[PDB]
């Protein structure tokens, strides 16, 4: 278990979202979407959710796992729509 | 259709916006609307006759008595504000000089002087209360009446101070007779017979103008100079600082009564012949005032000078009015 701050695209607030060190970025995005999609943001079925480090804008590959991302606990991440 | 006004119709077109005083005190008497039948009943009733003879037929005349304005502009609201503060001061003196044992420090001689010259005043002060309240009910304008209203309240205030101090004195000196002997002193002591004759006679002067003169212009200045000024100065010099301060505090009310009385005389002098009317009344009542001052003050220590001062000070009140 590892805490991160989700800054979901088109949402208005950053939120606390607990992910797992073994989660892939895709699974991180899914856990983050749970707190924004269909609550405050409309789904975009034709897009793919990507994870980007908020501070410098580093884009993490879909398959990279938290364990290898070099994140600081509670690190803020942008969850953006792409393709 | 009649359009709404910015003030009362009787005050419209005053140039300056009516004050609270003018809004609540002017042109309120309606018995003056029909001089031939002041009250809404048979015109021959005793009360109809009383107002026609003592209000309307008074030799002290004016075309518009409702124009009179109290220089202090007292209103019920401001009267209570003013006096509540003054009573906070007087009751504060009573409370704290008592805590101090002020009455126990008075000499036996002075205590006996209080029983003779101070406490019997409850009768004289109540007589003034009656005197000013009669003026209230017979004056030709509501603004004149109101000045008499508050003046009456002040006279009751003085009676009340006196009643309170009389009990305090009786508690401190049970043997003197405080509270019990005053009626006999007022009724039988030579020092008081001058004032007693003056106020008893003045109390049956029904003409509103003569009542005003007898009570406010002649009797009050004499009572004030003798009982407040003279007795108060004596009290202070004799160690009774409470009475010295009390008398001075009550003198503030007297000064206010003189201010409105002076304003009424001023207004009256706008009409030819009124000064002469007032001087006639003063001339009739002044001799009794002299007698009052002479009998009371001569019985006080250094009496002859007290008499000279009181006579001079009371006459000065009328002199300054013209």
């Amino acid at each position: 278990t590892f805490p991160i701050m989700s800054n979901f695209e088109r949402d208005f607030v950053i939120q606390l979202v607990p992910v797992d060190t073994e989660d892939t970025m895709d699974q991180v995005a899914e856990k983050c979407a749970y707190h924004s999609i269909n609550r405050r943001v409309h789904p975009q079925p034709e897009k793919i959710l990507r994870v980007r480090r908020h501070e410098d804008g580093t884009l993490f590959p879909r398959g990279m796992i938290v364990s290898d991302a070099g994140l600081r606990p509670t690190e803020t991440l942008d969850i953006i729509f792409m393709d | 259709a009649l359009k709404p006004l910015k003030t009362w119709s009787h005050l419209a077109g005053n140039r300056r916006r009516p004050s609270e005083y003018e809004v609540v005190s002017t042109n309120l008497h309606y018995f003056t609307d029909n001089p031939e039948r002041p009250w809404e009943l048979d015109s021959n009733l005793p009360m109809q006759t009383w107002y026609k003879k003592y209000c309307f037929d008074s030799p002290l005349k004016h075309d518009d008595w409702n124009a009179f304005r109290d220089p202090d502009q007292l209103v019920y609201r401001t009267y209570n504000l003013l006096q509540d503060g003054q009573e906070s001061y007087v009751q504060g003196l009573f409370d704290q000089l008592n805590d101090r044992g002020h009455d126990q420090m008075l000499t036996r001689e002075w205590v006996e002087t209080l029983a003779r010259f101070y406490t019997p005043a409850r009768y004289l002060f109540h007589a003034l209360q009656m005197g000013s309240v009669y003026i209230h009910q017979i004056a030709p304008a509501s603004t004149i009446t109101n000045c008499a209203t508050y003046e009456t309240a002040d006279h009751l205030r003085w009676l009340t101070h006196t009643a309170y101090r009389t009990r305090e004195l009786a508690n401190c000196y049970p043997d003197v007779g405080f509270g019990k002997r005053e009626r006999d002193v007022w009724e039988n002591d030579p020092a008081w017979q001058g004032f007693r004759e003056l106020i008893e006679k003045a109390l049956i002067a029904w003409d509103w103008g003569e009542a005003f003169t007898a009570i406010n212009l002649v009797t009050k200045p004499a009572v004030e100079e003798a009982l407040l000024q003279q007795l108060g100065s004596l009290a202070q010099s004799e160690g009774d600082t409470l009475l010295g301060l009390l008398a001075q505090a009550q003198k503030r009310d007297a000064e206010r009564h003189r201010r409105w009385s002076s304003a009424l005389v001023k207004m009256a002098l706008e009409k030819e012949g009124n000064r002469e009317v007032l001087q006639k009344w003063v001339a009739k009542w002044e001799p009794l005032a002299d007698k009052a001052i002479e009998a009371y003050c001569s019985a006080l220590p250094d009496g002859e000078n007290a008499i000279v001062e009181a006579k001079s000070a009371s006459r000065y009140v009328r002199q300054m009015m013209g």
Partner: protein, 491 residues
Amino acid sequence: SMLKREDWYDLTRTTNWTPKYVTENELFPEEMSGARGISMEAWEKYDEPYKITYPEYVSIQREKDSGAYSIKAALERDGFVDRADPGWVSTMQLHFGAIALEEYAASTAEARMARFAKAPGNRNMATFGMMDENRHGQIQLYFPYANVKRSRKWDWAHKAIHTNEWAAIAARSFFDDMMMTRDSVAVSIMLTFAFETGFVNMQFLGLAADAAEAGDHTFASLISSIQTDESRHAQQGGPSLKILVENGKKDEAQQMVDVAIWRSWKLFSVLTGPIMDYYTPLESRNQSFKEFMLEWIVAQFERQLLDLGLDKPWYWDQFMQDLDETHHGMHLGVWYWRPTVWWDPAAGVSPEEREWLEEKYPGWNDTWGQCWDVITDNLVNGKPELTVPETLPTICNMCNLPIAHTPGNKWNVKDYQLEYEGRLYHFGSEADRWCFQIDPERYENHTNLVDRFLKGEIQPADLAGALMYMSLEPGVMGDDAHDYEWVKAYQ
């Protein structure tokens, strides 16, 4: 330290003395004092139940105005008056015009006692009473003054009693008789006991509640504040009555009470009755005028009279019966002759209101309702001109109010005429005629509005001339309070 009030209070009223330089009768003229053969010593037994001293008075009354004036200032910009029910606005305009200057006049009635009562306790309490009415006259001028720019009608808060408008004449007729032209003792009985203790004390309590219910907190605070002053001086008649009864005057006392209560009732039947049963919105009516009278006025009188050793007035039963009729007539009269008053009378005869009236007064619709039926039909059928008068109604020579009573299916209108010294007088009731007969010299040559009209004193001698005589002009002349909105329910 300070003394306890009770330890020195008596000295404030130990003020009687034996005159020497003038006689007692000169100092206390019987026509002003009314000592009635009862000695100065006997009058000294007078003991007011509610006691108060100068410092207590100025302190308590200071806070009273501080609060009332503060509430008025806080609610002024709100302009509640501009959105209040029209019936409520009319209630206030009627209120201020009818009593503001009479309240002020009462300070003179109090002054009469302050100078002429032989009872020293009476003299002091009347001095406070004098101050009280000074307050009431002033505050009830200051408050409506805030509305002068809204309607000329508010000017009547000051103007009314200076006019010959019929309602003003009726008011002065009552007040001048009860408190302005009576000896000191009579005033304490007729004014403070009969009228203030008997009617005003409870009336203002109900009025303040009604104001709150109507959403007018400025007026509610005003009336409410005013009535807390009442008993302080209203208490003055009780002690006088005890003294008259324990000495040789139970009959004289009874007669003054009989007269005062009846005259008070007539004024009440026109100034209060119509308001409770017609101007107050249906949903705000906690009880009817009759219910109010039985619960808060009548029983209290019986209790008071019994305790004083007096009897119920000879007219008591009739008085009870009239609670079902009189004010209904006074209301219909005021509404039908609406152009003659300075406020807008509210008809109060919508279907729902008529249901309430039938419930509160069984038989109303078959009597009073029939007059209203005709009036309503004319309004529905476009004949408004048949809802205003073309003549004057007969006026009682005592109460100066129209002579009216039960109409319709139980017609019972009567005139208690009296021919006295070559003149025919008309009276609205048995008791009104009696008040004249026990003291004819007190009312003999007074003339009511009708008498003046018939004498040629109103010129031009027509309705327009009469309106001018009464100082009435378009702008203040009354009309239906809700502008006939209630007619829509009949179409």
